[PDB]
Amino acid sequence: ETFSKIRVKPEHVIGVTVAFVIIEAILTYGRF
Amino acid sequence: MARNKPLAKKLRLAKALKQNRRVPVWVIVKTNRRVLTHPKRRYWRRTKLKE
Amino acid sequence: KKLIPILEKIPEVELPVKEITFKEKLKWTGIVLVLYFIMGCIDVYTAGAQIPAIFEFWQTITASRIGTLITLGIGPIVTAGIIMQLLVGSGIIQMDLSIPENRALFQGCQKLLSIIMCFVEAVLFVGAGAFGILTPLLAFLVIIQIAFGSIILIYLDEIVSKYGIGSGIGLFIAAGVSQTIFVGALGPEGYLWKFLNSLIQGVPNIEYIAPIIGTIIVFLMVVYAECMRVEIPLAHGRIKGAVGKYPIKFVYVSNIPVILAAALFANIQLWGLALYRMGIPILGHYEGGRAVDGIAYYLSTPYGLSSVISDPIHAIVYMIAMIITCVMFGIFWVETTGLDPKSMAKRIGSLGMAIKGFRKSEKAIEHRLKRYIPPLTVMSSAFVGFLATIANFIGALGGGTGVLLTVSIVYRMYEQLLREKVSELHPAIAKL
Amino acid sequence: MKPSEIREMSIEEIDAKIRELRLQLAKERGLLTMGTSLENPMVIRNLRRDIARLLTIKKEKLRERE
Amino acid sequence: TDFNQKIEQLKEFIEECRRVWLVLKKPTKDEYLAVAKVTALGISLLGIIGYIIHVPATYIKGILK
Amino acid sequence: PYKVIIRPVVTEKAISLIEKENKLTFIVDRRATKQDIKRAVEEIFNVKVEKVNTLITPRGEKKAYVKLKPEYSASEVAARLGLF
Numbered sequence: 001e002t003f004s005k006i007r008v009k010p011e012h013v014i015g016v017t018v019a020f021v022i023i024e025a026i027l028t029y030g031r032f
Numbered sequence: 033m034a035r036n037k038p039l040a041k042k043l044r045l046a047k048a049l050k051q052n053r054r055v056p057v058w059v060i061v062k063t064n065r066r067v068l069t070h071p072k073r074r075y076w077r078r079t080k081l082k083e
Numbered sequence: 084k085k086l087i088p089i090l091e092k093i094p095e096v097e098l099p100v101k102e103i104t105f106k107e108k109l110k111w112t113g114i115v116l117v118l119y120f121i122m123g124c125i126d127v128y129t130a131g132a133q134i135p136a137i138f139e140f141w142q143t144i145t146a147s148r149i150g151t152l153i154t155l156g157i158g159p160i161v162t163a164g165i166i167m168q169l170l171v172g173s174g175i176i177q178m179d180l181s182i183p184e185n186r187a188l189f190q191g192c193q194k195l196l197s198i199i200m201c202f203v204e205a206v207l208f209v210g211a212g213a214f215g216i217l218t219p220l221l222a223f224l225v226i227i228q229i230a231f232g233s234i235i236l237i238y239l240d241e242i243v244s245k246y247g248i249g250s251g252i253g254l255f256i257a258a259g260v261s262q263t264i265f266v267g268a269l270g271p272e273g274y275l276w277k278f279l280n281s282l283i284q285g286v287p288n289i290e291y292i293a294p295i296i297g298t299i300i301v302f303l304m305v306v307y308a309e310c311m312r313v314e315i316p317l318a319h320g321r322i323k324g325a326v327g328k329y330p331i332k333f334v335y336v337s338n339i340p341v342i343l344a345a346a347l348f349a350n351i352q353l354w355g356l357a358l359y360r361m362g363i364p365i366l367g368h369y370e371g372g373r374a375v376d377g378i379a380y381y382l383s384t385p386y387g388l389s390s391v392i393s394d395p396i397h398a399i400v401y402m403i404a405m406i407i408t409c410v411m412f413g414i415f416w417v418e419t420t421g422l423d424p425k426s427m428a429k430r431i432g433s434l435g436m437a438i439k440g441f442r443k444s445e446k447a448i449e450h451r452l453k454r455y456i457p458p459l460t461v462m463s464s465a466f467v468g469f470l471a472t473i474a475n476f477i478g479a480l481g482g483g484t485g486v487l488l489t490v491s492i493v494y495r496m497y498e499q500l501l502r503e504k505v506s507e508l509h510p511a512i513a514k515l
Numbered sequence: 516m517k518p519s520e521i522r523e524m525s526i527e528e529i530d531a532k533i534r535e536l537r538l539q540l541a542k543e544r545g546l547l548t549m550g551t552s553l554e555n556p557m558v559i560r561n562l563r564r565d566i567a568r569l570l571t572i573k574k575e576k577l578r579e580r581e
Numbered sequence: 582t583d584f585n586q587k588i589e590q591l592k593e594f595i596e597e598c599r600r601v602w603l604v605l606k607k608p609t610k611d612e613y614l615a616v617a618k619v620t621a622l623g624i625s626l627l628g629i630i631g632y633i634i635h636v637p638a639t640y641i642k643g644i645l646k
Numbered sequence: 647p648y649k650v651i652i653r654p655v656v657t658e659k660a661i662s663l664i665e666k667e668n669k670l671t672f673i674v675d676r677r678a679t680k681q682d683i684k685r686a687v688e689e690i691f692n693v694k695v696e697k698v699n700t701l702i703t704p705r706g707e708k709k710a711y712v713k714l715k716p717e718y719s720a721s722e723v724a725a726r727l728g729l730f
Binding site: 116117120121123124125132133257258261262264265266269270271302306307309310311312313314333454455457458459461462489490493494496497498500501 | 594598601602604605606608612616617619620622624627628629630631632634636638642646
């Protein structure tokens, strides 16, 4: 892509989003 | 010139031109093993040629 | 950015070192697809949820919900790209994609802009009392959630654009639009029933049939447009006649363009409405997103059913406005990003492909493309613009524009996906 | 097409359709020679057969009449 | 000056559009049905999957407030 | 009714004859007359023919060089032919 030497593996990117989901899915509805 | 080619003789020469081509691929698949190229290939130094 | 230091400081997603078989390209795509949909059934915490923001022109083009975790949607990526395409495509700076420089520059800048616009759009929304919130503590809390969700999407977009099926943007739009239809038609509040039941009762269908006809018109048109391609012949197979053709995507020099065009109108209605509860209107007087005469009236997008087409002037202007803005970004698509006359050059000359009847040279074929280009490119755009517009007027589900975009993007992407769905029967691994 | 349609037509129609058949054939040969996107013997073949039919029934009538 | 410029250009231009517009593949039944098929099938896939997931999950998630 | 045109030739050579010269290149029947070509062309494509030059190639075909008058247009005719 660019000339970036900093790169991360798809498993993380995936995992950051499934986190966010879980967090607000319970933080909001029910306030667990 | 070369003299000379009448209207019909250009047609004959043209038939002769077609023959000097290798047999195309689609034929060999269609026969299903194989057809060798087979002598009707024309030279131009080596070809003297009754009518 | 435009400079090698700053560019390296943006973290990217790495290039595949993992397989991209049919199943694996699917498995990536599908993860994104679900996470999208899911994030749309979750609302913010502020100690109240299901607090939407007011818009009636933002929701369509982002193909996302508002008030959720993906309120901004695709919004940053599209906004950014409008600017990009206007500049490098007007040629006042030279950074057209060609060499791994200009290329890795265009990307890096456009990438940046998105992280900026995530925040900006979030802050701008909250700051105008969109959700009603206009107290600093709760205001901050919202801003966080908003922009961070959009940020996440940008990286998933990167995963789809390399590993998954097709590109990032396209997926999401098609995703959203599709759902909007399938849910509207077949869901709890489904049209099918409303239409079916009214027909059976023996009373008219003229407001339940309305969306359905609208969708058919769009499809019918677009489907036609997808048979029309410009085939350029390829070299002899050692047989007479030129066998094999190389085709060009008629609506692809007005696809990505109209996405920028529609988005352009949105940020005008937005900026006018924002500053009239946050500033003073200088653009146009918008309240409810539209007026009833004037500049405001004429620059509004009324997806699904309309009746404001009953004022002549309104129709006339909008149409020509869409048409011209599309033409612009269309010509400028040729210039920056894809379809270039200068990429397609050395490309057909390297493989030594010919046109029937000599035309084995570079310059022969080269010319016929560059020549042909401008008229196609203009025609395409002109055509689109109309289609789009009237398709919103008649009224259709997901909006005119939405159906268009979806049918096209999906069918070039389905093509790519068929060529993958078949090579996976054979031991060789698909990646096509 | 069918043999039936030719005999239902008036003599005037056989003539009109003959010319349209020819012009259409001329056009398809030009597409094949340029190269076509997929191979159709259909276009040249069918038109030649249609042209043959129309002419064959036309002449038999003409003999009968004269 | 310009009205003349544009008029001259438009004439040149339209005639080039007409050339292109014969090259562009004529849509007929076969072609049509081809696209329509593949297309619809695709849109169906995407479409179905979102219904089954969104709608049910929302009746659940929503009432958990 | 006249018609002795098999189809137009598509060649790079043909392009120069259409754009520059206002000429058309055609493949016509094997045994022919210039007069049968002049009139057949004149009806079919709907043009007035200035001239025909014809030569029989050694390929078994006859090739026709047809000159057009300059109230008529080589380009329009050629564009229709052999396209969709």
